[PDB]
Amino acid sequence: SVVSQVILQADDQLRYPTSGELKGIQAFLTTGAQRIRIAETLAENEKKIVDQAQKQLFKKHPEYRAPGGNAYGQRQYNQCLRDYGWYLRLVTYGVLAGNKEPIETTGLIGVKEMYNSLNVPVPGMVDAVTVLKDAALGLLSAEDANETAPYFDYIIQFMS
Amino acid sequence: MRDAVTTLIKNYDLTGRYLDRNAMDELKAYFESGSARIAAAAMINANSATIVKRAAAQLFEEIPELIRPSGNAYTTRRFSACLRDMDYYLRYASYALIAADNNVLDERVLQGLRETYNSLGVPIGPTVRGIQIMKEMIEAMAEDSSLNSTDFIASPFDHMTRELSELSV
Amino acid sequence: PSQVAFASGDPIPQNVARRTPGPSLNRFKEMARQVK
Amino acid sequence: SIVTKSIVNADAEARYLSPGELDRIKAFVTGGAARLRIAETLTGSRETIVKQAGDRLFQKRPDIVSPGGNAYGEEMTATCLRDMDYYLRLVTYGVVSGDVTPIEEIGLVGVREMYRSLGTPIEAVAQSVREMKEVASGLMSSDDAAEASAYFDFVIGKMS
Amino acid sequence: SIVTKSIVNADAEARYLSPGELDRIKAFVTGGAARLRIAETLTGSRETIVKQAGDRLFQKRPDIVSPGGNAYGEEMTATCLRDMDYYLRLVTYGVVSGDVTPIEEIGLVGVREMYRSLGTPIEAVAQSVREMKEVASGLMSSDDAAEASAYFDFVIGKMS
Amino acid sequence: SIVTKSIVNADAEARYLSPGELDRIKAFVTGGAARLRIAETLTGSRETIVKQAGDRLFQKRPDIVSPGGNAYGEEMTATCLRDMDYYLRLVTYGVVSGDVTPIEEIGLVGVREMYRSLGTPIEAVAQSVREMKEVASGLMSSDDAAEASAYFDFVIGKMS
Amino acid sequence: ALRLEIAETLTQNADLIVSRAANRIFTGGSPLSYLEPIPPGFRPINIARYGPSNMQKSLRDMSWFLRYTTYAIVAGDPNIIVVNTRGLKEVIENACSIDATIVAIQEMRAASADYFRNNAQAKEIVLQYFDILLSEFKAPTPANKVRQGPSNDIQ
Amino acid sequence: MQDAITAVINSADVQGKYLDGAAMDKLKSYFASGELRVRAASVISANAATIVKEAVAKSLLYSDVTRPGGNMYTTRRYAACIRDLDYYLRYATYAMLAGDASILDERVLNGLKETYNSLGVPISSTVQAIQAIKEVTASLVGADAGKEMGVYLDYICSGLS
Amino acid sequence: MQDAITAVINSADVQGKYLDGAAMDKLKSYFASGELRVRAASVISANAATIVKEAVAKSLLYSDVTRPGGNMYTTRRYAACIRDLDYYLRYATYAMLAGDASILDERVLNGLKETYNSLGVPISSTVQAIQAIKEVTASLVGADAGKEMGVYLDYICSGLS
Amino acid sequence: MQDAITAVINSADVQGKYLDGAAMDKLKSYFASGELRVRAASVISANAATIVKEAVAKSLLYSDVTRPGGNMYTTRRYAACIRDLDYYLRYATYAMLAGDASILDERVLNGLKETYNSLGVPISSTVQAIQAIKEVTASLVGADAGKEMGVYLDYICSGLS
Amino acid sequence: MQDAITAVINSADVQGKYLDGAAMDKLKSYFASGELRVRAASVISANAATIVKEAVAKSLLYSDVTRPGGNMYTTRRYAACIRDLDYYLRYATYAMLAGDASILDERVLNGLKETYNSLGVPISSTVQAIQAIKEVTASLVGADAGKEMGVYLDYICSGLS
Ligand SMILES: *[C@@H](C)[C@H]1/C(=C/c2[nH]c(/C=C3N=C(/C=C4\NC(=O)C(CC)=C4C)C(C)=C\3CCC(=O)O)c(CCC(=O)O)c2C)NC(=O)[C@@H]1C
Ligand SMILES: *[C@@H](C)[C@H]1/C(=C/c2[nH]c(/C=C3N=C(/C=C4\NC(=O)C(CC)=C4C)C(C)=C\3CCC(=O)O)c(CCC(=O)O)c2C)NC(=O)[C@@H]1C
Ligand SMILES: *[C@H](C)[C@H]1/C(=C/c2[nH]c(/C=C3N=C(/C=C4\NC(=O)C(CC)=C4C)C(C)=C\3CCC(=O)O)c(CCC(=O)O)c2C)NC(=O)[C@@H]1C
Ligand SMILES: *[C@H](C)[C@H]1/C(=C/c2[nH]c(/C=C3N=C(/C=C4\NC(=O)C(CC)=C4C)C(C)=C\3CCC(=O)O)c(CCC(=O)O)c2C)NC(=O)[C@@H]1C
Ligand SMILES: *[C@H](C)[C@H]1/C(=C/c2[nH]c(/C=C3N=C(/C=C4\NC(=O)C(CC)=C4C)C(C)=C\3CCC(=O)O)c(CCC(=O)O)c2C)NC(=O)[C@@H]1C
Ligand SMILES: *[C@H](C)[C@H]1/C(=C/c2[nH]c(/C=C3N=C(/C=C4\NC(=O)C(CC)=C4C)C(C)=C\3CCC(=O)O)c(CCC(=O)O)c2C)NC(=O)[C@@H]1C
């Protein structure tokens, strides 16, 4: 969280957290309520969001389900949907934490070679993340969606 | 580095002056435009890689020889190096737009570019041309977006062009 | 013995193609074609 | 500046600005109005603040102003007041910037060595800054006093 | 620009800008709209002005595309036309800025030495610039044709 | 050995062996039979080589065998002949390995200080290795003697 | 020496090899009109649908792949092929069919093998280098090294 | 030196293309500011000596700088300081007219720091004097023209820093 | 370290004896099998990523370790594990080319067991991954090269155990 | 500067010795090579401007260096590049005639890299142009005279690099 | 660094075409000379200490360079000169086997002039020493390989000059 980032910076400088860092921590503590609200809304509306995202992505990419793709088996299609669920869970974790650290340490660092080892196309997965973010933004309110969007955008950045 | 607030603070500290009315006005202007700066930064963060790809996919048609043999993007290695440089430019433009100051643009981009690019034989003209193409794409995207203020976006790319370009006249 | 005469021997001259206009001057090439 | 710190943290990882750092930047820009109100109060009250703090210091610690003290004499007293003015100006810079980096860079790096060279009691200087904090916090609302107290306390800690 | 020339002369004489120089700058800043109009006209006729000028130049000096000429072959003729366009662009910059210096620092200083190495006839290039001038006069109004013809004639004189 | 050096270089470079390195390994393996034949000849002629080298060395450098040197009576000469046999066996190991790695590991490092401690002239031991070289080359065929010389002279240079 | 004859032979009918690859890969016309064994799932590409510029790019890239294969064989190491191929698949997939590229590369390998077919010591190297090329091309673009700034000072 | 016009044309020519709409936008903005720039320049040119007189009176006169042992003590050094103030005002006028500090970088701030270091010129005193010049010029020319001139004066000051 | 030739040389040298018949025929066998070892190593290096990919696919894909809670769940942990498997493959190839297993103890088995214990890495799953690497490499290279590779792979697994 | 004769003379002088056998041998070698050197110098003098022309044609024409924004775009910049190549050709000819590279250090290389660094000039591109100059000179000069001229041009390239 | 192979391929690629008619000529010449050059390199490596011994005996020993007040006077400076001679021989071998002196440029001539001028090493004495090294190597290896190494030795000597 932002608390972790501030305390890590203070430890690195061998000093206590500064005034600006303390005020940022205070602001994050204040906005924790909307962070929580992000949490319940995403958690309880994942299923429609994930279904719409998967259908849109596979319509745009008629290869993985098609011959010569990656998700022939139901075990593979369920795996792609599981990856959506895990990504959106990580996004909720990161929004609740306030920064990108949970996403970074759970499903961001090394994910490119993660899916190279499995032959899942990184551009395909980044397109999937784009459609998932679009679905989440459409399903969330305007200010709520604006707050949630940067984390999905950063995930897209790190993916490609 | 130094954002606009830091550079104004340094300027007034130089003469040992308290923050006067003009200093307060400039600070207020930066603080009011901070919302538009953050919005543009969010937009460019969302569309960074695609913007750079489009910039290259127009720049190499503007200068076809940069992908022909003996051009400095011929290999896939060279092509990825060119893309990395353009992504560097976009990232530092984002940083400069949020900072409202080109000091970061000078400290971490321009202070050795001609040295490095001449050492590697990399042209310094197509580089700025691609930078300006990136700026035009960014401006068009921001204008399409609901950004009330977007004039500040042209500042970092223009400073890049001015500092990294050759003094033709 | 004389097979080692790589550099000390007469150098093998190469061929350097004279530089020519490229696709960056396609507009001018077409202008020349129509000015034909 | 908080903008400086966030941009530097981003560049140290080579990524674009993270959502958390953008949140911090937005909070800083929103609070900029209160920052300027506090800073303008400080600069308008610079004469009164410095005068009252100097009077309090010269009363609490008469040794520094007594003969044989560093501040003894008209010129030495004027220079002590000028240093108080310098630190008040640095406090204003930190208030405007939302952090203590300008205070650190201008008047808190090597201050111990400089005042050792000049023969000044660093604890006395810290006491002067603390009195400046009290006088200034007496001239503003509760929240603004707490806001300026962070910069004042940072100077106190760096001096003692 | 005319401002640059006036500033350079004033600096050389170690004096402020003359009242007459200031009046000239005033007239130029007022007529900036018209000069922008001429620049836009030339930029519009860029792909036709040089084409027609090349037509006239080739019909006047067949040796250029004739065997043994500097521009024999379509590639060399295209290079000749690219120089054509470069000179027209220089004229555009000069009329916009109100000064011949942007013209000279790009395509007039040392041009004879630069073209001796290429074997191109400087007199031929000057005749080409002439033909461009008549094409512009045709595709321009009366007075503004004279205004641009001043700079065209300057280029012609300094080259031929 | 060549294989040892290839593995060490591959680890230092952090990758498998290149095609050229595989080619050189293949060539070394193919020539292994020939080098093993060379060592077979050396081990067949080991005793006579040592005897002739020893007597030639004693004739050429009487100081070693004369009073004041390290060769006294029978025991010192026997110890020197044991050292000479050790070095011949080391040369055979180098011949079979195709690399001077076994010679260096068993004895090539610290030999200078060891003979300094024992009073043995390193120049004299290098000379003795030399006469071993000529005797072995005479006992073997000329083209065969090339590699035996290429190792003997390395030993002589290291013991110079 | 043998690498030199390999290069001379492949350069000798580079046009033929690229033509026989292009005709096999692309459908609807003559790929050679404006030249500059395990098909997984591909579909032949219409020349007119692909267009002049895209077809020019694809043809140039096939000939270039053959050219670096010859260059790598002459040099003796697949480093050139690896460095110029390991990431090209992602940059190429955006407007170029990976399946068509794979079948074209396999066509090139088979054409080289059938045309040369001299000896294992003379042909297994060619087979090895096309196999390395195909593996590198099939490999997805790897992540970049990231020299993180040691502190706030260093980017 | 590069003014706004030559700067735009330079950015265009290093790209090789004609002035598009944005170039004309920048040029029209510069021409719009041109009238205010020229008015300020003419007023400053007329009131050249008086501004330097006021600045010296405000900052340096009756100070340790102008007393014995100060670098502005001897008559020759006083005249040199006055000429330097004239340089600062004139090159500020040039930068105002050209819309850029390129001339300041080429001529004014070109070796100035170590020039004054070698000569012994008090950097803080000269910076305060330049600030006084900026204040007097802003008072004599107006809020907007004063701020515009002060941008270049502060550029010179920060360069001296 | 050492190899087959170096090991036989050291074995003779500890008794300080010349290369006898046993050393001679051991060197003959190593020289004969050197071509096979080179071929298998070349194949392994050419297809190196594929062996690790297939081994993980048939070993730990859709598995408890990949499940959250295990040591294989996160993307970072998965990348670290695949890197460890790739280095184990490379060291096995080095051992097979060498003909001697001392290189594994030299570079790998010094502290991997205790470091995995400190990090809480499942040694049983590590051994299973090593075994799956064994079958993948055996299938890809051939039974003759497969057994030779599996000797060092089993050495690695036993050392980790 | 110093030719080969001057170098031998200076060495003998600094040692305070008469011209011994070795000095006579070196002088005889230079005298042997002298006629060929004169022939090559005359040829290059006849074809001076041409050689630079085809050098740039094979190297820098229709390239990013000569595009707008490059360091050779403007007519004046192109003239400066031509002047640099003319100096390089003439000084390589002088060095070839003198049999010594000391003239290059005395005249060209003593500050030229700092010159190009302050000028922003691309050392890689200028080295490419000089390299092309090597073959363009070799064609008109022969084989061994070509080798000598290439040696002096390589000295120039090393100095620039 | 680079070799003849990479130089040929670079030229071929920059021209954009395959190795058509003369790239293969140079390549076949390089491969033909390869075995003899490798044998020469092996001989030089075996005789490295000796060659330096006769070279120092011929050129530097019993001279003002070795006497007091010379740059090869003290024991440390003697060892440094010997190590430099070994450097020259090693990089001559590298250039001979790579077919190009670009290794000499990047690794030998990159800062050779700077280091030697800063230290005070006599350029003429070093050149004489390298000439003696070249002659000794030519005698010990044959006239053919002697000249082949001497071209790179003379390149180093000219760079020193
Ligand atoms: C008895 C001393 C041993 C011996 C001597 C010997 N030395 C040389 C040649 C040289 N000796 C030196 C040594 C030094 N020069 C220095 O400046 C220093 C520090 C003051 C030292 C130690 C040098 C540099 C030479 C080279 C010759 C020259 O001076 O120019 C020789 C001649 C070797 C030859 O073949 O030329 C000899 C004989 N020899 C013995 O056997 C004794 C053990
Ligand atoms: C005979 C060689 C001449 C001579 C030599 C001499 N050299 C040094 C010191 C140095 N020489 C070098 C050169 C190199 N080091 C490298 O790594 C390379 C490329 C591989 C080169 C060319 C360097 C770097 C030094 C200094 C650092 C070092 O120790 O290596 C000295 C010593 C000078 C001193 O007084 O310190 C000497 C004497 N001396 C002669 O008289 C001969 C003409
Ligand atoms: C599609 C079936 C075929 C194809 C078409 C194609 N290529 C590009 C763009 C590029 N192709 C390359 C090629 C190479 N890079 C190398 O290093 C080598 C040797 C290994 C080659 C052959 C590169 C670098 C590019 C990008 C730069 C460029 O324009 O050349 C396109 C254009 C894509 C776009 O417009 O964005 C197309 C349509 N390439 C193949 O390989 C297929 C056979
Ligand atoms: C009196 C005879 C005339 C006169 C004098 C006058 N001077 C000033 C102010 C200054 N005079 C000087 C002159 C010098 N300083 C030096 O060091 C030397 C050389 C050794 C000289 C000649 C200076 C520097 C000043 C500036 C003020 C200062 O000293 O700080 C004034 C005051 C001007 C004002 O308005 O402040 C006056 C009146 N005035 C006359 O009318 C007499 C003819
Ligand atoms: C769906 C959007 C895409 C897709 C999916 C796909 N994934 C796999 C296999 C795996 N995916 C994961 C996922 C993660 N690993 C992590 O560390 C995290 C971050 C916390 C996640 C989300 C893992 C672990 C595997 C392998 C192990 C397992 O499945 O338990 C496959 C399988 C491919 C194959 O079997 O060959 C697929 C298909 N495929 C697409 O095409 C979409 C773009
Ligand atoms: C056409 C009217 C005449 C003509 C032209 C011609 N020019 C060239 C080649 C070049 N021309 C230039 C000139 C400029 N470059 C600039 O940047 C500027 C200012 C913007 C000028 C004036 C240059 C630099 C070249 C070099 C080519 C290159 O850039 O690569 C040619 C061809 C030369 C060749 O060898 O191909 C020709 C034919 N020739 C005529 O006969 C006409 C009278």
The total beta strand count of chain B reads 0
Q: Globular, elongated, flat, extended or rod-shaped: what is the shape of chain B? A: globular
Tally of helical runs of chain B: 8
Could you give the count of β-strands of chain A?
A: 0
**N-to-C series of helices and strands of chain A:** HHHHHHHH
Q: Which structural class is indicated by helix and strand composition of chain A?
A: mainly alpha
**Number of helical runs of chain A?**
8
- Largest interface, C-beta within 8 A: B-D, 31 and 33 residues
Helices and strands of chain B, in order, run as: HHHHHHHH
Distance between the termini of chain A: 24 Å
Rg of chain A: 18 Å
Measured between the Cα atoms of the first and last residue of chain B, the distance is 30 Å
What's the Cα radius of gyration of chain B?
18 Å
Bound molecules: phycocyanobilin
**Range of helix content of chain B:** over 70%
Relative helix content of chain A: over 70%
Beta-strand percentage range of chain A: under 5%
Major β-sheet annotation of chain A: none
Oligomer: part of a larger assembly
Task: Looking at this protein, list some descriptive labels.
part of a larger assembly; 11 chains; A: 160 residues; mainly alpha; 8 helices; 79% helix; 0% strand; G: 155 residues; two-stranded parallel ribbon; 66% helix; binds phycocyanobilin; Sll1873 protein (chain C); antenna complex (chain B)
Describe the structure.
- The structure is cut from a larger assembly and holds one copy of chain A (160 residues), one copy of chain B (169 residues), one copy of chain C (36 residues), three copies of chain D (160 residues), one copy of chain G (155 residues) and four copies of chain H (161 residues).
- Chain A is an all-alpha fold and 160 residues long.
- Chain A is built from eight helices and no strands.
- In chain A, helix 2 runs antiparallel to helix 4 (74-97), helix 3 (46-60) crosses helix 7 (122-139) and helix 4 runs antiparallel to helix 5.
- Chain D has nine helices and no strands.
- Chain D is 81% helix and 0% strand.
- The radius of gyration of chain D is 18 Å and the shape is globular.
- Chain G is mainly α.
- Chain G is built from eight helices and two strands.
- The longest helix of chain G has 24 residues, at 52-75.
- The longest helix of chain H is centred in the N-terminal third of the chain and has 26 residues, at 21-46.
- Chain H is built from eight helices and no strands.
- Chain H has one domain: Phycocyanins (Globin-like, Orthogonal Bundle), CATH 1.10.490.20.
- The chains are: A mainly alpha (160), B mainly alpha (169), C mainly alpha (36), D mainly alpha (160), G mainly alpha (155), H mainly alpha (161).
- The B-D interface holds B 1-3, 5-6, 9, 12-13, 16, 18-19, 24, 27-28, 31, 34-35, 38, 41-42, 44-45, 48, 91, 94-95, 98-100, 104, 108 and D 1, 3-4, 6-8, 10-11, 14-17, 22, 25-26, 28-29, 32-33, 36, 39-40, 43, 46, 86, 89, 92-93, 96-97, 101-102, 106.
- Bound molecules: phycocyanobilin (CYC) (6 copies).
- One phycocyanobilin sits between chains E (64, 69-71, 76, 79-80, 83-84, 86, 106-107, 111, 118, 120-121, 124-125, 128) and J (61-62, 66, 73, 75, 78).
- Chains D, E, F: The modification N4-methylasparagine is found at residue 70.
- Chains D, E, F: It is a peripheral membrane protein.
- Chains D, E, F: One of its GO terms (cellular component) is plasma membrane-derived thylakoid membrane.
- Chains D, E, F: One of its GO terms (biological process) is photosynthesis.
- Chains D, E, F: Heterodimer of an alpha and a beta chain.
- Chain B: InterPro entries: Allophycocyanin_b, Globin-like_sf, Phycobilisome_asu/bsu, Phycobilisome_asu/bsu_sf.
